[PDB]
Design a binder for this molecule. Sequence first.
Ligand code: HEM
Ligand code: HEM
Ligand SMILES: *[C@@H]1O[C@H](CO)[C@@H](O[C@@H]2O[C@H](CO)[C@@H](O[C@@H]3O[C@H](CO)[C@@H](O)[C@H](O)[C@@H]3O)[C@H](O)[C@H]2NC(C)=O)[C@H](O)[C@H]1NC(C)=O
Ligand SMILES: *[C@@H]1O[C@H](CO)[C@@H](O[C@@H]2O[C@H](CO)[C@@H](O[C@@H]3O[C@H](CO)[C@@H](O)[C@H](O)[C@@H]3O)[C@H](O)[C@H]2NC(C)=O)[C@H](O)[C@H]1NC(C)=O
Lengths: 186, 186
Amino acid sequence: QSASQFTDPTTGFQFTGITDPVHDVTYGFVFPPLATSGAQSTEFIGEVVAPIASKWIGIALGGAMNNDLLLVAWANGNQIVSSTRWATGYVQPTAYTGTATLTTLPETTINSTHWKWVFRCQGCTEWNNGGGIDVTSQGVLAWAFSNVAVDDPSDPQSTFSEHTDFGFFGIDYSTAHSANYQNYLN
Amino acid sequence: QSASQFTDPTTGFQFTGITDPVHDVTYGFVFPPLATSGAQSTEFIGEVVAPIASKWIGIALGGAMNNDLLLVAWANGNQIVSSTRWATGYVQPTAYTGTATLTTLPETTINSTHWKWVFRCQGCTEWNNGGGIDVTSQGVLAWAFSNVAVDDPSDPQSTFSEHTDFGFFGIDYSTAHSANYQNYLN
Ligand code: HEM
Ligand code: HEM
Ligand SMILES: *[C@@H]1O[C@H](CO)[C@@H](O[C@@H]2O[C@H](CO)[C@@H](O[C@@H]3O[C@H](CO)[C@@H](O)[C@H](O)[C@@H]3O)[C@H](O)[C@H]2NC(C)=O)[C@H](O)[C@H]1NC(C)=O
Ligand SMILES: *[C@@H]1O[C@H](CO)[C@@H](O[C@@H]2O[C@H](CO)[C@@H](O[C@@H]3O[C@H](CO)[C@@H](O)[C@H](O)[C@@H]3O)[C@H](O)[C@H]2NC(C)=O)[C@H](O)[C@H]1NC(C)=O
């Protein structure tokens, strides 16, 4: 599948991403302005907009399950629980051992039909194995879905069962940068 | 997703299609030679190679659930049960009333781990609603998956529940024809 640009109707944030029509989960990404005289930033802002039957969602930032930074999140009541994780094989991803900061932004909403996680991901484009994403080029992102609750929803490091679906989408990161990035943070 | 050309390693048939990595079902299509002179053929050969946990599979020949010819099939023991269907709104597709003949070809194989349905679809590029597929152009195909058994597996017109997954792929019909099509038939 292929990402495209879209606007959050509540916030007006402008993202690049997709809506999976099966689970009707929206995934959106936006990056700071491209630098020419300095190295690129290592942070980005993203969103997951998920129907409440979505019990956990994961994002694979390198487009595959293994050896890339993963983001995992779920609703637990009126709060999002989230974590940065990693998998070396096809088994339970565990806490990421590098430096990465996931911040839930206040635009994050939970209501009766959907949870909407809006986050800041710092240190998420370069990983502690030397891998990462190139925000000036084209890449692939992937997502994981489950409709089964995590084993212990109040724990960010909870274990859980294999996703019931997963998918991919191509993204041209060179088009996903925004001059309004700073304002989104504010 | 995008289709590519591949060869069936047992039969040697050359198909254009994809493998869905979630349910590990392969969808392949091959068309008779394009005509330079006159109307195109209205038939094609296809295959579904599915793990036996796949309880029913559907193919949407127009790339959508509604207003296009649908093919539905499942394993019932050591036989494939299949039918042509049509959907009026997002409800249980019913028997197609147009001109289309679905034939199970002798290459069809069912074993302990997979069912491989190889079929001939005559009259399937033009539908009795006046719609159809343009075999000289680029189009979209879709598939539907369930891991739950149909309500009556011995009935080709069995009712069944909503698919648990569905997906799409782009296909360049202009490169999906084969000079060996007639040999596939004999
Ligand atoms: C206990 C939890 C997990 C288990 C046991 C697991 C298991 C697996 C297995 C067996 C596959 C191969 C499926 C196929 O190709 O047929 C797979 C693929 C995949 N998994 Fe997971 N997974 C889990 C958690 C996660 C999480 C949390 C994410 C994302 C944050 C994820 C993302 C992926 C992706 C995107 C793929 C497809 C691409 C690939 O083959 O690398 N998985 N997983
Ligand atoms: C009793 C059986 C069925 C029911 C109740 C049903 C229901 C639905 C529903 C509600 C959707 C919309 C999903 C969404 O976008 O979230 C849909 C989508 C779709 N269905 Fe079905 N379906 C059934 C059988 C089939 C069959 C047999 C096929 C193919 C042979 C099929 C192909 C598709 C496809 C391709 C889509 C996505 C594209 C589009 O929205 O038309 N469905 N179905
Ligand atoms: C619970 O959260 C969800 C997700 O944010 C809310 O649904 C979203 O609500 C917005 C605002 O109405 C929808 O945007 C609107 O879209 C329509 C259709 O094009 C357009 O006519 C409006 O002008 C506006 O742009 C958005 O589509 C919708 N998203 C989803 C996934 O449902 C929902 O409203 C929240 N529930 C409550 C009770 O507040
Ligand atoms: C039941 O039928 C399925 C589908 O035909 C069998 O799986 C298929 O087995 C063939 C081998 O005859 C595989 O082709 C081989 O692939 C390997 C690796 O790519 C290659 O080295 C060989 O030269 C040959 O091309 C094919 O990949 C495989 N397809 C799938 C979807 O698994 C299955 O083995 C049969 N089961 C039993 C118990 O007979």
